[PDB]
Symmetry: D4
């Protein structure tokens, strides 16, 4: 089929992932765990010593770390430092599928000059992924400045009236006619999954 396996680390218990990981990882393409608790990564180190963990990403993969299967790369960009978790969740997921990924972090619209410094890197990426929370303006900015496919991920980070990310989700929908397609809140996985399919062309 070509796609690795993926589970639901937050939806399952501390060991149901490992009870089915051995029934699902019978020497096949590497495994992926999304939404894994920072504490539950320690309660499973003795069960799988050959496991790597990404604290910022809250994801863990046990197996092969593939190589670039395409000369083009995906660009993950984020406005503030508060969205770095869901950014790395998308980054390591786009890495498991076998796509080189370039990280462009802390590039909010409050400092728009920071984007034009890294615009040459963003424009030369087969797909780009915009991440935002409070006032998801970054999507509209990169959408009108980059004529390449963009995936938008809203984040639940923020305080009052952000509505746990709902008001960023509505922003990036309202600027979709610029080449932007948006997925669900905190769904860095679904963005990198779709971005991988577009990059694997």
């Amino acid at each position: 089929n070509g796609f690795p396996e993926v589970i639901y680390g937050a939806g399952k218990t501390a060991t149901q992932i490992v009870g089915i990981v051995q029934a699902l990882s019978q020497q096949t393409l590497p495994i992926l765990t999304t939404r894994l608790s920072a504490e539950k990564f320690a309660a499973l180190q003795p069960a799988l010593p050959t496991a790597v963990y990404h604290a910022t990403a809250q994801c863990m993969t046990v197996g092969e770390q593939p190589a670039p299967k395409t000369p083009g790369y995906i660009a993950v960009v984020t406005a503030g430092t508060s969205d770095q978790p869901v950014a790395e969740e998308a980054a390591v997921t786009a890495e498991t599928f076998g796509n080189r990924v370039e990280r462009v972090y802390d590039v909010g619209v409050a400092g728009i000059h920071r984007l034009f410094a890294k615009l040459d890197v963003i424009r030369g990426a087969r797909v780009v992924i915009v991440i935002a929370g409070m006032e998801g303006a970054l999507a509209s900015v990169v959408g009108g400045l980059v004529d390449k496919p963009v995936i938008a991920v809203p984040t639940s980070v923020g305080y009052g009236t952000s509505f746990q990310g709902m008001t960023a989700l509505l922003t990036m929908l309202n600027s979709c006619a610029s080449g932007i397609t948006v997925v669900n809140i905190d769904n860095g996985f679904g963005a990198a999954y779709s971005a991988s399919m577009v990059n694997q062309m």
Copy 2:
């Protein structure tokens, strides 16, 4: 006591003769009066009743009276995202001028083509205050906010396609951009924005 304010009438709540009954009752102070949000038909039956009255179709407002020079040399900037927001922006611009301010309009400056914003950034930054008006693309307030170090009044507009929610999303996004002096007002309320912007300009 009056502190130098022109008179304002809500043109949508009154009938075609109730507003001319309040204009001719105020036609003695020599200070210009203003009427907001009145339809083109609400004025068409008035042109014979008020020969000394001028109407702005795009702004949907009417002002009648001798309008003297601006009270302050500073100018406020009315920034618009797309062509579909020209009504509300002109509603704010024509009412901002009536209170006695100079106003430099900066229209069609959406994020779709940000270079248009950097073209007129010098005019926007050198203004006492800036009023941002945007609809489906509520991002414009965030961009201008972080690029100007002067007060900003954001005004969402109801024009948009689906999920624009008659400008409700534009309201939330402008609210979540209160970083570098962003301040939002009600939906479509170009007047109240220019009301607050006139006091800041004439501090």
Copy 3:
């Protein structure tokens, strides 16, 4: 710089003569232009002004210009749930073809009668991308998503009975289906979906 894109005009924001003032001003590049979401009356007063223009009533769009061969041999699939979503789907299909793509339409493929989906599954799966369009029954994006291993752009539609919320529920359900490459766009935004789908098809 232009990278090979046809021209697009928002037909709902302009008047009947403002769009023919922009068509004849662009009638020199020989590259076809497009106009989205213009009413049948907004075109009826134009047929004498543009003899070389064709209109799609179901799509509510107008394209004028010599349309050459497709730029890529791949084809995108426009999948529709019910007969009531034919407008938006055709809006996406006719604009997806203008950018220079082949498109194989797959209509009336609702979950009410899933066998109709398994009938044309071979055509849908062998396409470079797939655009799903659904209204009250937002489930179609979820089913096609888990059944095709190609990118999918979901487009909710406003048509529906009560609680459909002008397609708002269809938006939420398509958003909660981002498993196997599902990606949603704005309500009724068949154009923006096909805009993104054209770049993925011509990577």
Copy 4:
């Protein structure tokens, strides 16, 4: 009357259920406890040793476990493993009322072939109960494929934009013209109650 008794395990205190269970279970049809805390099942074992507990269902019944009062059975189907709690809450409630119930678990639309494998069992059930959370598509699928009464239960399980189950509740309402009638979020009890009445015909 024919119906057993039922209480509100989460709405009452640790012993108000037992203070009224003896005033209400004076040797009558078996008793039922909905929404009972996993901890409070241990603080009441000494008070009623003849009590059975279902951890997955979070329900406990003290008395007779009846037999099938009708040759037909009710089918409880669920899309993912995250809805198994409210599924078993409905399953054991349909069992107390005296209806045989067939469980068809982990049958999401992401793997639609899993449903057609068990479709012969679902189609031959006097009533079926669909359970879903994220993108409640399963209801519409079974509704258009099974010409038998369907009850729909939305679940609060899920992350962003699921709105604690609200966005599944709206989905199954919008496909009611296919023989689907939907109840409240996490209300596995009300679904099995109605499904029992339909089965007891």
Copy 5:
């Protein structure tokens, strides 16, 4: 394979001739067909096209075909809160009868005057199923639910004053009443309620 169901057409999505093109194409099975939610003008241009067709203005539905005896001796009860819910209730009643059920209507049984409910409680309780229909006063489903030990399908209606939210509150209240067999359907969906109620009546 068909299991004994009459044919149904969504009269709101089609044009005045598209539904008569589907009626005459089905005028060979001798099994009656049904059309829901078609306007009185959508039928007025049809009376010459279908002499063997009967229309129910209050129900906004049309049925054409030889309608035989009921399939089961049991009867379902259609309970209505106020006079303003007669349209949707009759939409459910006329479609519930077409599938081959007897139906005993119980109208104007609002909580404002609960004695009217206790008057016809004997008729309601002795029915195989009961369909409750209510608008601003969504409480009726809760009262009947706790008073009958038979399945109940609740149907909210969009009619109401402010805060009724086109029947959205009626939907929530009927949802929070799932105690004694209450089960809610979509807004105004009298058909789908009667569709489910026909299968329960003919178990």
Copy 6:
């Protein structure tokens, strides 16, 4: 003026109420504390030994318990046992203001016969106060059966789709033409305050 004093027990700290209670209760009409924590009632017993506490009401009054200043009484009615807290919050507040109050508890619409048993008491009360949460039908029922002023209080108690009491608030508004006026969620104080004014006529 005639009205006792009232504070905000949940909005203030453990002793700001007592720091201002002595500046506000300089030998005047009795004092009232709304929304007081069950734990904070113990951290203040040494500061005011002449204080009475109502655990169910989560309110405490320090001073005179007045007598009926009017021969008529207010009736507080509640559908289920889960609304008894906010019911007693209204009951003891209507008692401080000097109105006799009759309690009619556990009278849901699921057992409508329980209401007609106590309808003779409800109908003879100058004001009545309906309390409800899940499916606030009780208000509409008593409103159409009692031609006397009714105050409606929605409660935050309930599970899914109750929206922390929001969906009961909308119900009792939609049946206001029957002599019903509704206040805020869990605002038993504001109901008894208004009911007192109507009774003190």
Copy 7:
């Protein structure tokens, strides 16, 4: 049994002849009847049918019958925020008078110019009950509530600009003001407010 209440008909739910069929059927008790929320056209076709009927255009209500003296000497106060709330307030005032109460109207008492409230505060405070009616500026209920020690029934109105949400925000703000006897009713429900206010006035 009737306890002294006039008759009330929902004028919006019935047709132009159904309400005159209920008026002439009640034209024998000599007790006046009332009809709420009927349009000016719904009465224009009635003036010949009921010569002994009077209509209130601002209130959109019609009352027919010999109206005797007030039942109690106390008076209720109907307080209005702006000129745009005169319809609903008059709907409450004319129905409050029909039940047999004196009512002292206090109009145009918005927070924009609070001195107008302190001018007529003596009249408002000395009333048995007070009904507050406000739209976009829902603050008026909070101000009057803390300034009068008599029961208050708040009534939000649907009139407003953006974000007023057809008076939904006015409903929330009046709900969050339940401090000194504030009690809110449904949107635009001036009748139900006056229904409750008549029982409190005649305790």
Copy 8:
């Protein structure tokens, strides 16, 4: 530039603020920390002993406390004592930027006479800042009584139907034609930032 630096105390970790404070406070205008945890103010005292902390404001500034750079002052007014936190958050932020600020606290509409006692002070302030939560009526009152620029801040404080401050945000928007411009919930920083710009004219 003229503006001091500001961080996000709640969005960062216990020391990321200090890891970048020394890279950002290389002997420049004073530093500002918004939304700082009451506990995290103690875990950083050994790292910066020359730091002052405002418990009510939940903000801490390390450096110069400037002097009035303009003879006019900003007025922060609040209705109840429950909004004093976000009030002091705005007060100390307007103080860092170099504006004298006058505090007018506990001035709700329930006691409107308290406002007219301090109205002479409010009217003589180049900018005023209204703070409110439950029934944000105070903004409309001061807006119609003060012909000077007003900034409105809604607070998340309150109970039922306040919707974590959402229903105050909608109130002050609906009275913007009186010279009122409103910012986000609990955003005392953004209000004082804008109020400073207006005062620095």
